[PDB]
Amino acid sequence: AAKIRRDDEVIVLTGKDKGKRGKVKNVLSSGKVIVEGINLVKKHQKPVPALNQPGGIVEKEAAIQVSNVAIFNAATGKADRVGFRFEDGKKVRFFKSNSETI
Amino acid sequence: MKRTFQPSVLKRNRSHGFRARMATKNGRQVLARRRAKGRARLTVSK
Amino acid sequence: SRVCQVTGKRPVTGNNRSHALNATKRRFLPNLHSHRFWVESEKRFVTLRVSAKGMRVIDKKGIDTVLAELRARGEKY
Amino acid sequence: MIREERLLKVLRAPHVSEKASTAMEKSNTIVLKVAKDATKAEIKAAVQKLFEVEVEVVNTLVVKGKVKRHGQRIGRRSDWKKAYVTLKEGQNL
Amino acid sequence: KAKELREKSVEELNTELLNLLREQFNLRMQAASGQLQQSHLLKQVRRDVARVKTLLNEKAGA
Amino acid sequence: TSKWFNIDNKIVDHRP
RNA sequence: UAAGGUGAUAUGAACCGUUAUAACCGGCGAUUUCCGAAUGGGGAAACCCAGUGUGUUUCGACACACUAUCAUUAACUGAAUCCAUAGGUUAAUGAGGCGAACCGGGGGAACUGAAACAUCUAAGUACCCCGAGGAAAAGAAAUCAACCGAGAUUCCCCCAGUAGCGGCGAGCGAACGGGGAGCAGCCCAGAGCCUGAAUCAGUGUGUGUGUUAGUGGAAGCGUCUGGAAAGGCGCGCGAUACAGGGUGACAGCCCCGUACACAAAAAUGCACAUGCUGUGAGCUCGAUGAGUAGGGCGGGACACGUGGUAUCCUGUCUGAAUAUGGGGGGACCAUCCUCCAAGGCUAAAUACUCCUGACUGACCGAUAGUGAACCAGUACCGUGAGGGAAAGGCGAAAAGAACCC
RNA sequence: ACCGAACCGACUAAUGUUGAAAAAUUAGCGGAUGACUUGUGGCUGGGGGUGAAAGGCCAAUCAAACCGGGAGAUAGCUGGU
RNA sequence: GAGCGUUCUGUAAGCCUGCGAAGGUGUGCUGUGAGGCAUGCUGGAGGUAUCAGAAGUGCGAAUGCUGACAUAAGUAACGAUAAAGCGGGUGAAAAGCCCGCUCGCCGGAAGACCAAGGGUUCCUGUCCAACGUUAAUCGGGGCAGGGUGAGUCGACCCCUAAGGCGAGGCCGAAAGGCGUAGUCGAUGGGAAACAGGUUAAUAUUCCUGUACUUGGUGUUACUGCGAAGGGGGGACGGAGAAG
RNA sequence: GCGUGAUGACGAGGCACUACGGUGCUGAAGCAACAAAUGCCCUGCUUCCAGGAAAAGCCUCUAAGCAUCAGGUAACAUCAA
Numbered sequence A: 001a002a003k004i005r006r007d008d009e010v011i012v013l014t015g016k017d018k019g020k021r022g023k024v025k026n027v028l029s030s031g032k033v034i035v036e037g038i039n040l041v042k043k044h045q046k047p048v049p050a051l052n053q054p055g056g057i058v059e060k061e062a063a064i065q066v067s068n069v070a071i072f073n074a075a076t077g078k079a080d081r082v083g084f085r086f087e088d089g090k091k092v093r094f095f096k097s098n099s100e101t102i
Numbered sequence B: 001m002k003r004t005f006q007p008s009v010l011k012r013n014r015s016h017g018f019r020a021r022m023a024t025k026n027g028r029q030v031l032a033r034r035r036a037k038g039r040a041r042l043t044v045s046k
Numbered sequence C: 001s002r003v004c005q006v007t008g009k010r011p012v013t014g015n016n017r018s019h020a021l022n023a024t025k026r027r028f029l030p031n032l033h034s035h036r037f038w039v040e041s042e043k044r045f046v047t048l049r050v051s052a053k054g055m056r057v058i059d060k061k062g063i064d065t066v067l068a069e070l071r072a073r074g075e076k077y
Numbered sequence D: 001m002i003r004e005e006r007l008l009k010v011l012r013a014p015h016v017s018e019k020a021s022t023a024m025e026k027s028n029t030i031v032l033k034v035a036k037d038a039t040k041a042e043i044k045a046a047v048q049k050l051f052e053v054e055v056e057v058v059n060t061l062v063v064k065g066k067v068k069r070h071g072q073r074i075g076r077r078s079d080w081k082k083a084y085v086t087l088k089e090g091q092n093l
Numbered sequence E: 001k002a003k004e005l006r007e008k009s010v011e012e013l014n015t016e017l018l019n020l021l022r023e024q025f026n027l028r029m030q031a032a033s034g035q036l037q038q039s040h041l042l043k044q045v046r047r048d049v050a051r052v053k054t055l056l057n058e059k060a061g062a
Numbered sequence F: 001t002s003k004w005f006n007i008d009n010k011i012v013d014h015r016p
Numbered sequence G: 001u002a003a004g005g006u007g008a009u010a011u012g013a014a015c016c017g018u019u020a021u022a023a024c025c026g027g028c029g030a031u032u033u034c035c036g037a038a039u040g041g042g043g044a045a046a047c048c049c050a051g052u053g054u055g056u057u058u059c060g061a062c063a064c065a066c067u068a069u070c071a072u073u074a075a076c077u078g079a080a081u082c083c084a085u086a087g088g089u090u091a092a093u094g095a096g097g098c099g100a101a102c103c104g105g106g107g108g109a110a111c112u113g114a115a116a117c118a119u120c121u122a123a124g125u126a127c128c129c130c131g132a133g134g135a136a137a138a139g140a141a142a143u144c145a146a147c148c149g150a151g152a153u154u155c156c157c158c159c160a161g162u163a164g165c166g167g168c169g170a171g172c173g174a175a176c177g178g179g180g181a182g183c184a185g186c187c188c189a190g191a192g193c194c195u196g197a198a199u200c201a202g203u204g205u206g207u208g209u210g211u212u213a214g215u216g217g218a219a220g221c222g223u224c225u226g227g228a229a230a231g232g233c234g235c236g237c238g239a240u241a242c243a244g245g246g247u248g249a250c251a252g253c254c255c256c257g258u259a260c261a262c263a264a265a266a267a268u269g270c271a272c273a274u275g276c277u278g279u280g281a282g283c284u285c286g287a288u289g290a291g292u293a294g295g296g297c298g299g300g301a302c303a304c305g306u307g308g309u310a311u312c313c314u315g316u317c318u319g320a321a322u323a324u325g326g327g328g329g330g331a332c333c334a335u336c337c338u339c340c341a342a343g344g345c346u347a348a349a350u351a352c353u354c355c356u357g358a359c360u361g362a363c364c365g366a367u368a369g370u371g372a373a374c375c376a377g378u379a380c381c382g383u384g385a386g387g388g389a390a391a392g393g394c395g396a397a398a399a400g401a402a403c404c405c
Numbered sequence H: 001a002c003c004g005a006a007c008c009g010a011c012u013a014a015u016g017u018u019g020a021a022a023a024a025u026u027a028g029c030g031g032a033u034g035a036c037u038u039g040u041g042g043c044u045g046g047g048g049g050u051g052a053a054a055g056g057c058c059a060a061u062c063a064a065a066c067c068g069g070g071a072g073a074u075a076g077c078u079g080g081u
Numbered sequence I: 001g002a003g004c005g006u007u008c009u010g011u012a013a014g015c016c017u018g019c020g021a022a023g024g025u026g027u028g029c030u031g032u033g034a035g036g037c038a039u040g041c042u043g044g045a046g047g048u049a050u051c052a053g054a055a056g057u058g059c060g061a062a063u064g065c066u067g068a069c070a071u072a073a074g075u076a077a078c079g080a081u082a083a084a085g086c087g088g089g090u091g092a093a094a095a096g097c098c099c100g101c102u103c104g105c106c107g108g109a110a111g112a113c114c115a116a117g118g119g120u121u122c123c124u125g126u127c128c129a130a131c132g133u134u135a136a137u138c139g140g141g142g143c144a145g146g147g148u149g150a151g152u153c154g155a156c157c158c159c160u161a162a163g164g165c166g167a168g169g170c171c172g173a174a175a176g177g178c179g180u181a182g183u184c185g186a187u188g189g190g191a192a193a194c195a196g197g198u199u200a201a202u203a204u205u206c207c208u209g210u211a212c213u214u215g216g217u218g219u220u221a222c223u224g225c226g227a228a229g230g231g232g233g234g235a236c237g238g239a240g241a242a243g
Numbered sequence J: 001g002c003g004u005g006a007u008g009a010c011g012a013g014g015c016a017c018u019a020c021g022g023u024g025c026u027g028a029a030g031c032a033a034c035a036a037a038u039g040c041c042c043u044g045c046u047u048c049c050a051g052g053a054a055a056a057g058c059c060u061c062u063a064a065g066c067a068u069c070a071g072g073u074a075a076c077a078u079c080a081a
């Protein structure tokens, strides 16, 4: 199973923006996630009269590695690691380091 | 000047076609060699 | 083919060796002849391509025995 | 008898062009792109029973593929059959 | 769709197949004429025709 | 291939 | 098994799915156009044309199935010819074609070496053809040995580059015996007591071990340089896990993993145990493979080139003894020794890799390594067999340059 | 049979000879109802075919085609090291 | 006889290195030489001491192999000695494109239709990078869209020639050679459509008008029908002459 | 050749627009003589020697067989190509 999933609260371990927190918007197949408000890039959008005729420079979010983002504990207030357990037949995910089920 | 290739599809197919290759025993060997090489086109038909 | 129906003799290869020992390939052919044998069990004449050694085998063993052997080996006659 | 399975499979598409529009407005003819293994009787039965019109005759022709180039990689657009179906003066699809 | 298609008899399956084929023809003509923004209907009808054929073959027992 | 004045015989065999 | 997904260049549109019919992976099934052994006839492969039998029609027609040849067996029918045979028709069973190499067999070169060349070598090699298998072949002494003995076949190391063969040149080159790998013996040629008993094949049924999907899998922070820390410095923790890969620079502790412990509804391999079918063991008496062994002529195989040449095979011509007999012991004779041809079956050790998985490398790194790291047997060339390339790298992430001249 | 276009051929001269062309152009030249010429198709295969015979022709190749193989033949010879 | 260097293995989970590695390009020092050392600039992530070990270990020559780039040189040439001139249009630009008026060339062809062969080159819109021996607004170039309509034309189909294959068969070490019954094989024999009109692009195919052929079914009338067999026909040369 | 097909079609031009490329409407005479093919009668006729495909379609006769049935001929209708 995947340790970091959609709509989690994550904290960036390494990169331009180490320490910033964010919420995962969607997870790509290539092991990359898009976290809202984290990895901002300045796209120069080309205006097209058929569709989206405004131009301008647009600041959007780019993909960051699932290895680079780590789950946020929110109890100890810092990053944590996720294991897997069986509770009542369901494979559930839990923070290590005080062993609390997510 | 009259050159050596005066083309004709009928003579081409009766000479080098797939059914002539299967008709002679060594033509089947030719097809075996070409399949073992991996040709896109075995005979002159396509 | 030049194959005896009874004894199975077929051509074999050898050499011509001359006085200077020059070796060139050659074939030994069996002494094949097409002979009509009178079979009494069927009141019939059966034609066989048989060598003279095969004819001697016929005369020793009996035509019925070798016809049974030929039928066992499966070849027609 | 030609089965409804066969009819619903053989009629593929309408055809739009200047010549098809002229044929419609002049000779009461519709132009249909048709699957290749369909015959004249099959096209006539399919049109007559699915469009609820009546057919005088049908004319078929096979449209050949086109050799195209996509980034210096040669390809071959495929064949299809085209059918000119003539109607009996009072149908007007 | 599979179980409720399986809980039908052969005549119901054949007329379901004919209805699905009629819908397939209508969708194909609309998409060729320049309508039918919804192509998932084309895919769904094709796969459902395949399902109906599968159940017909199983009910015939081959 | 080859030049015609090299294939020729009257000029190639010039000094026999 | 899952919170994501609708294969790639390749975005986009329309959507499906989020606790279980999304998607993905595995077992079993279903569909599987046309050509191709192609198999209903034909054919310029992917096309043309049918015959027959069922069933349906809106009376226009439509759907499905079968129809090749050869071999064996059986039925029916049946000539010259009176029975019979030859033949014909049908039914059932089997075969055909493809595949890298290894294996058995039928044919079989030459360049070359001899410092020329012819016997000889190259060489029973290359190549052609036939057939079979997971291996094949060979195999249970008419074998060797030496007066002592061994005990089927196969493969490796010695014997030994020895004895021998040899225009006694070039070259070819054993065996006896010894050390190992592996071990296994039986049946018909025929009658009787006896019960179907040992041993093998198919078909089921149980137990293990797998194979085809998978699950869990430990332990890190602060600070400085820096675009970015995995790097420097300080201080901790795991280790049956420091194999390997990725992550914005070099990570045991960020991710995938690894050691380890588990997992199978369904199909299948193997080793057991157990039913049915087919098969027969044990004991007594008897029998002991004939155009054969051998011989004359011509060849071939044995390291052995006809030589003093044993032995094996046979194209031609002959031709015994047959257990009170016969073969071999390197011309041949006598004595002695040892074995029993003219019927057959048999595992292992051994040979190879088109293909599958894992791991390795004092192997290569884009003129190298496959011809081919890239849509390569492609483009192109030739009527055809056939020949046959070039061409890898932005960046960490497209943030791939809005807008103005 | 004769003269002469189509058609078949190729006697002479010049041009061209890295050409417009791996055999032609231009101006003249020979046959032109015959042993003629031509279209489509078939057959003959490499020590072989075919040859009104030149060792001519057999796919721009012929005192023995082309393709793959024995093959890395051999080279007391030349070049390079 | 003694050595330098290069690639790779061990020493090496060591040492140097984002405070800048290899590589590239200069400078300075140094050894008898092959060479070494230090550093500036580009580079942007690897390199390797020391002592041993293994070699795809060192290139200027082979009419050497592969790529790149010079030279002759802005030289020869620009492909029939049938021939061009002007006005207007479009365009950034016109000797070449479009339209017009002249001029010239072919006219048993340099005109029109096919078979063979090719495959979208046909027509329309747009573009001028590359192709076109110059330019290009043009093209048989790029891109996109359209276009080929059959009972009568041709194939398919019936029938055979040369010849091919060939159940059985005869023959041959094997493969295979020939060949009967058959079955293929046109370049030949076999039924039937003409005139006018239309599209930017098809027409004996579409439309208008007027026809023709073969076969199946069903009524009517008369009636001996039937082949794989017999006969006729199909069915055939060269030249010439005239109506 | 003639009649019919054809009181039809086509027709020089004239009239009107034009996106000046071409469209829409109407339309008189529409005969005779002569010359004449290498084309047709002619797969003919005359002549010559070198003596000039095959099979099916087509017409016709019967065998086995069917025998007031099938089947055949002639007309009409419809369908199909």
Ligand SMILES: N[C@@H](Cc1c[nH]c2ccccc12)C(=O)O
Binding pocket: F003, F004, F005, F007, F008, F009, H017, H023
């Ligand atoms: N020189 C002349 C003739 C020619 C052609 N090939 C030849 C070969 C050898 C001698 C002369 C020639 C030419 O070019 O046409």
Ligand SMILES: [Mg+2]
Binding pocket: D057
């Ligand atoms: Mg019509």
Ligand SMILES: [Mg+2]
Binding pocket: D060, D061
């Ligand atoms: Mg058509």
Ligand SMILES: [Mg+2]
Binding pocket: none
């Ligand atoms: Mg066939």
Ligand SMILES: [Mg+2]
Binding pocket: none
């Ligand atoms: Mg068939």
Ligand SMILES: [Mg+2]
Binding pocket: G041, G042, G049
């Ligand atoms: Mg046929």
Ligand SMILES: [Mg+2]
Binding pocket: none
């Ligand atoms: Mg087989």
Ligand SMILES: [Mg+2]
Binding pocket: none
């Ligand atoms: Mg020699």
Ligand SMILES: [Mg+2]
Binding pocket: G114
């Ligand atoms: Mg020699």
Ligand SMILES: [Mg+2]
Binding pocket: G115
């Ligand atoms: Mg020599």
Ligand SMILES: [Mg+2]
Binding pocket: none
């Ligand atoms: Mg065996």
Ligand SMILES: [Mg+2]
Binding pocket: none
């Ligand atoms: Mg003893």
Ligand SMILES: [Mg+2]
Binding pocket: A001
């Ligand atoms: Mg896991």
Ligand SMILES: [Mg+2]
Binding pocket: G217
């Ligand atoms: Mg883990």
Ligand SMILES: [Mg+2]
Binding pocket: none
């Ligand atoms: Mg750190």
Ligand SMILES: [Mg+2]
Binding pocket: G249, I045
């Ligand atoms: Mg870096």
